Design a protein around this nucleic acid. Structure first.
Lengths: 86, 84, 63, 53
RNA sequence: GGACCCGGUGAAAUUGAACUGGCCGUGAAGAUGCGGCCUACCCGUGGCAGGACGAAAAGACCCCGUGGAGCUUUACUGCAGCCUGGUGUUGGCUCUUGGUCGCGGCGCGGCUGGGGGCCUAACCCUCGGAUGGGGGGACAGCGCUUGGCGGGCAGUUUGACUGGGGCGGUCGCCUCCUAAAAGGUAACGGAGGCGCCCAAAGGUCCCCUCAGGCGGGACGGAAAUCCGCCGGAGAGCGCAAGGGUAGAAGGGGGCCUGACUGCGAGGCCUGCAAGCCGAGCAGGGGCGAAAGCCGGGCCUAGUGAACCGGUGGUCCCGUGUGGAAGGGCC
RNA sequence: CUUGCCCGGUGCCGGAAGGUCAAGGGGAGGGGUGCAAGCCCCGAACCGAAGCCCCGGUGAACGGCGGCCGUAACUAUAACG
RNA sequence: GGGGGAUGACCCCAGGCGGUAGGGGAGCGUUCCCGAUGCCGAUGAAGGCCGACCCGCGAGGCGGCUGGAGGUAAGGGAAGU
RNA sequence: AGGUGGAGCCUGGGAGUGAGGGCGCGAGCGAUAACGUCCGCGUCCGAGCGCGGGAACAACCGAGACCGCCAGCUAAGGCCC
RNA sequence: GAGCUGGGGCUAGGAGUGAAAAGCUAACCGAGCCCGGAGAUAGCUGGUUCUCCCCGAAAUGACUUUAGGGUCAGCCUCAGG
RNA sequence: CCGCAAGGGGUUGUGGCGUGCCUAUUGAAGCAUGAGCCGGCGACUCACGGUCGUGGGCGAGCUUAAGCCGUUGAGGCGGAGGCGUAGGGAAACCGAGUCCGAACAGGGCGCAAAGUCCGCGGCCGUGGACCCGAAACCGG
RNA sequence: GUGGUUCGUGGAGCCAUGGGGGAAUCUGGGCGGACCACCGCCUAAGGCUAAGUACUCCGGGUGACCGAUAGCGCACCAGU
RNA sequence: CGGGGGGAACCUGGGGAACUGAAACAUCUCAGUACCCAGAGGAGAGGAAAGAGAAAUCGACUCCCUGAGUAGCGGCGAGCG
């Protein structure tokens, strides 16, 4: 009443990472960028990444959310010109 | 969450504006200085607030909500059943 | 003549004039779940759509 | 939970009476009859809190 | 002796229909009927078996229906019978030891338990010549509950996958690769981890600068321990991988426990349920002078519906009212 | 003519002193309502049956009845070890 | 679908129209119940037999031969179609 | 932005199949073997995606079958019989 | 001669009998036959009718003692905004 | 041969293009099955519920069972009830508000848009219920 | 220890009983759902009782009920 | 003096089941049904309450509608109700 060996055979299961909302769309106080949950969002867009430059999301409200390192936590604000006096 | 048999008690649904109005047609009886207690639509008189008391009237019934009883005071009375 | 899984009608169930129906959260709790707290704050009510048709119906009539 | 007399043992802790308790998992592993910390029972707020059970 | 020619009589399964040739090719892959071609007059009777996938029969060998029926045992349960405690119509007489509470003890005391005896009037049997005797006899038959054995029988059951059924494997969940570059997809396709744990890897406030290589000296000749230079961090992080990433998650020390209740705007993935994130609002703390962080961990595995019940809290229900059994809510 | 070897498990036969344990007797004690005498339950220490556990006997009862290394063996188990 | 439809219908052009499970709309005969101020037939009910008018159609009408007695509903209803 | 033109979105009733293959391509397995299977991107067929072609041949090249027998241009493919 | 036999009867069909293969029990008993539950259930198999109009399917994904079923989705259709 | 004449009837000699028909099928002429031939029987129905759509009577709408009236036989009275008239909640109970809670942060709802009875239909449940089909179990 | 009841062992009663104990005659004695106080109901452990509902062999009436393979299978020397 | 034997259907008592549903099947269902038995009648069944319930309210039994597919029973599942 056990299990065997020499049959590696070991399928893998599912995930579901994304950039949801991609860069520069109607910004809604909701899941910003994703690739590491428990995540700790930030302020506006993000531009820090194992790449160099930065990314703007011409969309501004409360805040967004990170992914743990990847992408690059937000902080470089950027409400967007669409955040002035009505 | 249900019981091991029957039991139960009682009470009903009778309210404001409701009366004032359809009771406006209740004026075919005690709809003058109004000793309510129809007898037409329901069973076990209760008085729902919402609306705006009126037709100045004393009501021989069970009870009613906050405002209601209030509004009541707006221009009418309030009598309770059996013992209260 | 008709009745209804009176059951489910008992447990989880019961509609609003809206023509809709709901039953209590239903995450985990109430079995195994030393788990956590905030998770607790995880039992109010849950309204599933579509299917709530078998349901409602099958119940139909009194509820 | 999966009751496993394996250094894995579930326990709680009163609120000096603050009244009832609050969730917690544990391990004899170390410090046996050891278990204290504060919270806040329906009883006002806070209150020392032994855990033993 | 049929078969053949005569006279007489005169069936029967199967068959859509048909004037149905060979070829070599073809089509669903073994064609008279489709293509090209070659022989080719119309019908018959006595025959000879090859093809018409000929006839017989909705394969018995196969697998599939959470079909059926028979036998098997340490399959599941249950009954028949059998053994069995107490109880009954199963009455008397005496011999006895045990418990117990009261007043290791002994005397007594109520209590009550074990047991040994002919009898004996039930009961049964007995008969043997009549209703009386005889034998057994409180048995037992036999009734009720106990418990036990119990395939003797009765009823169900004994999964899926499966590049044929079986044997062999294997089913959950975490990562890589496969996915062709958004997301995401089989394969019994590749390889590898998990059904832990840590009360201190918890919360903050305060400090630290890795592996390694080279050069110089104790106990030291791999491999420390210190001292002086070189360093997109290649060390570091309890566990598998992969992302991360020292600025640090990462290495110490200070007090501290939010490893919070009431909640959550608003999103990720999604047929279901789940799964997962999260500012900010309030009560109440902790850390810092403070600007702020704290609602366990660096993460993504460490898993489970709803019912069937336990228990600590409620004081919501309580089936004539007063309550409690019992129930709902935490 | 001749039926040999094993009762560790199993069925059985015997044992019944000891563990266990049903209904049951039999009381500590708690509980509900009770103005109170009362009035219902839960009740447990101990006594308590076969069975099973434990001791033995059991094979024309079920059933079973070893492995490899060395050695005279000019070569092969073997007489032995 | 859209440009004016008087009830028809007529004109443009856009615009397709192959279709099994299966989804929506419209019609046909079949035996019956109306007889919504309905009745035909001995110079044939009806079925039968045969056909170069009416309809996309499933059917109609209508004319010739047969045969002994029925039943048709201009319109709505019903169903063993 | 939109030349387009005719798909789109929500609410709601009624469904069917819940197992397909064939071809090109990019991958998996497989003897880079099979009219093999296994995932993907487009097409394909669906018992009519019926006709043309490639002799014949769903199916690959062209084609979208409302209907009009004695019209006209071409596709692919052909024009010695 | 556990001999063949006529006539008379006894047993019986979840039960009989059986010099015993599951044999024989009114010509196919691995549990008879008739009437009754009853038109048992039957993811399987067939079978599944008159015309015509309109559009136009899937043969994937998710969970199943579920894999040749079916739930929910995805692709159809009609009513309104 | 022209009882519907300058148009058609019937029959075919040739040639010309042509794989039958049904179920289940990835796919079928079939060599897969279904059927020899003709005529008649023969298969999505009824009931109670519920469910949307529609034809229409009042918006508070509507009727049981029965009493009476009945060539034809003529319906007419019957007001227990039941759906709508708020709902929200396990409940107490409150109530156009309410439950969680001790907090003004959300869930359900308020906001009338109001049905209801009936008729006729596409369907859904109970039904033998689209129609026949087996091996078997159980009674006498 | 079973029954019936909506009650499938349940907080589970009433009535009915298979076995064993075996009360009372009106301040008696069951009952209103474990039990208990108080209130409220009823008076058992014998018997008879037409009418209001069911059913068609029989006779009649009526049919959006049938026409000889339909109707009961059987319209007449058929359960033969 | 009465009985017993009948008798399509219907009546109460006596006894009394699997299929099948639960997409298995042991609980459950079909049901107290189908069947067998006894017996009453032209009708039996039952029938003046140690009843019902709670407004100090109702009163024979029966049957139709309703109560109600409600209160409720339950591997709280199919259903029963």
């Amino acid at each position: 009443a056990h299990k065997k060996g020499v049959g590696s055979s070991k399928n893998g299961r599912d995930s579901n990472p994304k950039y949801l909302g991609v860069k520069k769309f109607g910004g809604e106080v909701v899941k910003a960028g994703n690739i590491l949950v428990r995540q700790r969002g930030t302020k506006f867009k993000a531009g820090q990444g194992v790449g160099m430059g930065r990314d703007h999301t011409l969309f501004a409200l409360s805040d967004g959310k990170v992914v743990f390192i990847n992408k690059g936590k937000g902080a470089r604000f950027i409400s967007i010109e669409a955040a002035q006096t009505e | 969450f249900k019981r091991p048999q029957k039991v139960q008690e009682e009470a009903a649904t009778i309210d404001v504006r409701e009366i004032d109005e359809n009771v406006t047609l209740l004026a075919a009886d005690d709809v003058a200085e109004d000793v309510r207690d129809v007898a037409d639509d329901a069973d076990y008189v209760k008085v729902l607030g919402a609306g705006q008391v009126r037709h100045e009237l004393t009501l021989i019934a069970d009870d009613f909500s906050e405002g209601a009883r209030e509004k009541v005071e707006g221009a009418g009375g309030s009598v309770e059943l059996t013992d209260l | 003549p008709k009745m209804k899984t009176h059951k489910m009608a008992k447990r989880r169930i019961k509609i609003t004039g809206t023509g809709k129906v709901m039953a209590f959260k239903s995450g985990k709790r109430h079995q195994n779940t030393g788990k956590s707290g905030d998770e607790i704050r995880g039992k109010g009510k849950g309204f599933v759509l579509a299917k709530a048709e078998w349901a409602r119906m099958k119940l139909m009539l009194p509820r | 939970a999966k009751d496993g007399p394996r250094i894995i043992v579930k326990m709680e802790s009163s609120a000096g009476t603050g009244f009832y308790y609050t969730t917690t998992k544990n391990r004899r592993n170390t410090q046996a009859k050891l278990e204290l910390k504060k919270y806040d029972p329906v009883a006002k707020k806070h209150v020392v809190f032994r855990e033993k059970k």
